[PDB]
Amino acid sequence: ALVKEEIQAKEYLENLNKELAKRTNVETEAAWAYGSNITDENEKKKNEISAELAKFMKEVASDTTKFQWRSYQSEDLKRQFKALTKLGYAALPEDDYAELLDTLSAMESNFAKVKVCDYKDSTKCDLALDPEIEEVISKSRDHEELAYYWREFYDKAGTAVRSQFERYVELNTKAAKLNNFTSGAEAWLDEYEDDTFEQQLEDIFADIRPLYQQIHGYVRFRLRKHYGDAVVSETGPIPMHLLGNMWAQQWSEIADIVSPFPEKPLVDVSAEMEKQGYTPLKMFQMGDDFFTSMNLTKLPQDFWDKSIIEKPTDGRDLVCHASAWDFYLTDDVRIKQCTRVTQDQLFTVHHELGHIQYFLQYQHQPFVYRTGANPGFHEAVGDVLSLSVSTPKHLEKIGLLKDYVRDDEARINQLFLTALDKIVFLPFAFTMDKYRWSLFRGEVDKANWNCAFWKLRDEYSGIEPPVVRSEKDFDAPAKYHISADVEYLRYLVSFIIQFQFYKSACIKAGQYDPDNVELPLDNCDIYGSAAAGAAFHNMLSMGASKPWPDALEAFNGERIMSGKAIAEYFEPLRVWLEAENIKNNVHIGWTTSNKCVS
Numbered sequence: 001a002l003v004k005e006e007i008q009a010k011e012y013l014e015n016l017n018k019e020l021a022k023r024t025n026v027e028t029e030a031a032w033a034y035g036s037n038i039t040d041e042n043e044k045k046k047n048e049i050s051a052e053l054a055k056f057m058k059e060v061a062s063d064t065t066k067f068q069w070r071s072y073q074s075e076d077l078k079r080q081f082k083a084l085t086k087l088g089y090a091a092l093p094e095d096d097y098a099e100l101l102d103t104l105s106a107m108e109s110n111f112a113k114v115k116v117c118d119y120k121d122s123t124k125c126d127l128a129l130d131p132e133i134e135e136v137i138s139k140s141r142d143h144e145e146l147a148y149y150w151r152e153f154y155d156k157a158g159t160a161v162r163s164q165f166e167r168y169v170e171l172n173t174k175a176a177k178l179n180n181f182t183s184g185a186e187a188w189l190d191e192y193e194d195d196t197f198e199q200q201l202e203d204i205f206a207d208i209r210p211l212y213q214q215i216h217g218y219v220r221f222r223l224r225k226h227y228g229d230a231v232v233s234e235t236g237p238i239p240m241h242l243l244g245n246m247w248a249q250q251w252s253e254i255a256d257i258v259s260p261f262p263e264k265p266l267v268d269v270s271a272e273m274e275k276q277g278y279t280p281l282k283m284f285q286m287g288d289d290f291f292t293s294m295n296l297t298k299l300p301q302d303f304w305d306k307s308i309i310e311k312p313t314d315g316r317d318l319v320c321h322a323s324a325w326d327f328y329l330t331d332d333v334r335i336k337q338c339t340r341v342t343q344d345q346l347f348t349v350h351h352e353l354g355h356i357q358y359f360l361q362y363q364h365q366p367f368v369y370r371t372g373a374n375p376g377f378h379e380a381v382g383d384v385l386s387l388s389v390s391t392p393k394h395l396e397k398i399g400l401l402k403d404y405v406r407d408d409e410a411r412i413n414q415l416f417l418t419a420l421d422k423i424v425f426l427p428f429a430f431t432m433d434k435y436r437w438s439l440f441r442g443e444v445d446k447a448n449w450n451c452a453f454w455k456l457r458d459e460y461s462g463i464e465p466p467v468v469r470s471e472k473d474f475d476a477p478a479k480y481h482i483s484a485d486v487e488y489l490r491y492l493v494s495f496i497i498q499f500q501f502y503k504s505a506c507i508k509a510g511q512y513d514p515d516n517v518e519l520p521l522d523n524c525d526i527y528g529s530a531a532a533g534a535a536f537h538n539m540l541s542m543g544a545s546k547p548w549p550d551a552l553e554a555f556n557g558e559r560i561m562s563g564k565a566i567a568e569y570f571e572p573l574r575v576w577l578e579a580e581n582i583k584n585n586v587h588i589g590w591t592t593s594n595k596c597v598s
């Protein structure tokens, strides 16, 4: 009967979890070796271990049907068994799984090996995205130079893998249906355990959208004064190569030319970092210090011994795109980052260390629970710290910001600077998955795949390519996450919920009072707050043991994803910016782009 079986099932799960952790450790090591050192030998090794683990998962999924798990009394045991039914790609027949793995590594390695020629010297053709091309995109204000690097990169990282991407969509769809989801869109959405999740995001996005339109309008106005009306039109989408980022996902690199008050200070601490002799090691030690100051977990010795925190100086190929790794043992956690000494990189260091902290907080959990409450939670942790490290308050403490007077106009500059990252990112993040959902669901014919991409980038972000594109190009995979098959909705969710976490953490730290002008949300520093740390410990140690609303409740008593906190943060900017656009008769909104020929 069921009473004896449930007792046996508990013993089965305890053993199986340990076995899965150990088998996944082996797969992860292989994936790490390939990511740090791209070779045909390492690819073969990585993909063969994965096929072996997939085969074992099939046996596991099959074995769950032998247990009457849906009949059990324990919610915890049922939740664990349910986790074990979720095969994903491992549901594919042996040969199809092997083909998908070959397709995925072909795309990620193509991206990682992209090299372009120097604009000024066609002899020098060893310029990688990280750091060479990104340096030019972020620093150059020569629109024809920017356009050149845009075209070269997108042609190599995007168009070159069209056929591979098509096969990936086919196999992703096949895998989803084998798991009885309609498509890979629904498979991705299952991670959020909420049948109204899409609508919830539409609703939140609609509330923030008008603020984005105002920022867009003002930035376009300021770019016209810089580049002139031949380069930037008043009424059209912004030419994306002028926004200081290869994908126009963040605009903070052009802050010096679009800032509300150019005679008042704009925080940019890169020069001081360099002056004070900062290194990648110091940046990571500072990040570690922040976490420990909050009474959270110190980085283990394995992290320092095994991480790769600087780009290797031999001729080898690797994935430089920053990442954090869990090896599912004890204290074996690693970062791989091609760290540069800049302000934005300091934020990225904290982002990645947020992942590491999460890994450490839930490593005592059974294997199936050793992941985020939802994917957005994992992305939010580090960004919460980054919000406080970016404050004038904190940057002055660590001696990176000198002779700073925090008047109303400096405050507006800082809010605007933050918005150029945080608000600008929202429509970007939404479109990355909206696009892939539409392909996964079979809503766009293959003949229209590229213009379907640029249509969304137009509709939501109001940006366009610097040159005319067509269905002869394929631009989506020029973004890492698209080439590497990493779901993007996590970042949209993160950018919303991180303000929920930040606001609550700041109240707990005594750093925010809505009725005290001395304690504004935009100058909150949670450094050294054990009270904020405690809330994180309560939430992060849970892992995926409970549905995400219970994890949020453990942090601050709330159970709902809400746009209230992000709106509250930027409210002073909104009021000012609305008035400023009216003062300057700034055109808001945009005409449909002519940059993608059907």
Ligand SMILES: *[C@@H]1O[C@H](CO)[C@@H](O[C@@H]2O[C@H](CO)[C@@H](O[C@@H]3O[C@H](CO[C@H]4O[C@H](CO)[C@@H](O)[C@H](O)[C@@H]4O)[C@@H](O)[C@H](O[C@H]4O[C@H](CO[C@@H]5O[C@H](CO)[C@@H](O)[C@H](O)[C@@H]5O)[C@@H](O)[C@H](O)[C@@H]4O)[C@@H]3O)[C@H](O)[C@H]2NC(C)=O)[C@H](O)[C@H]1NC(C)=O
Pocket: 066, 178, 179, 180
């Ligand atoms: C995605 O959805 C799929 C459905 O679209 C689903 O596929 C179905 O899975 C079922 C297994 O859960 C499977 O059901 C079995 O069918 C066998 C015969 O099917 C054949 O004939 C049918 C023609 O009429 C065709 O439609 C099929 O294609 C096949 O040719 C049965 O022999 C089998 O039975 C046995 O198992 C049941 C289940 O027992 C359960 O557990 C305990 C036993 O330990 C019971 O006490 C309990 O009550 C419960 O019933 C026993 O009752 C029985 O005695 C037999 O031992 C079973 O019904 C079905 O064939 C399959 N396909 C289709 C088209 O329906 C996928 O599994 C889903 N995938 C995922 C990942 O979720």
Ligand SMILES: C[C@H](N[C@H](CCc1ccccc1)C(=O)O)C(=O)N1[C@H](C(=O)O)C[C@@H]2CCC[C@@H]21
Pocket: 249, 321, 322, 323, 324, 348, 351, 352, 355, 484, 486, 491
């Ligand atoms: C740098 C970071 N990269 C990693 C990608 C994660 C990953 C890496 C490899 C395989 C699967 C997932 C991350 O930590 O999420 C990243 O791409 N982004 C996103 C991005 O740059 O697109 C925005 C997020 C806010 C700050 C940086 C974060």
Ligand SMILES: *[C@@H]1O[C@H](CO)[C@@H](O)[C@H](O)[C@H]1NC(C)=O
Pocket: 037, 039, 041, 042, 314, 316
């Ligand atoms: C990269 O891998 C090759 C074999 O594929 C190995 O011989 C070499 O040591 C690795 N290089 C580095 C720098 O680790």
Ligand SMILES: *[C@@H]1O[C@H](CO)[C@@H](O)[C@H](O)[C@H]1NC(C)=O
Pocket: 295, 530, 531, 537
């Ligand atoms: C630090 O954390 C421990 C347990 O994680 C807790 O017992 C202790 O009270 C914390 N320190 C402070 C000052 O709250």
Ligand SMILES: [Zn+2]
Pocket: 351, 352, 355, 378, 379
């Ligand atoms: Zn992340």
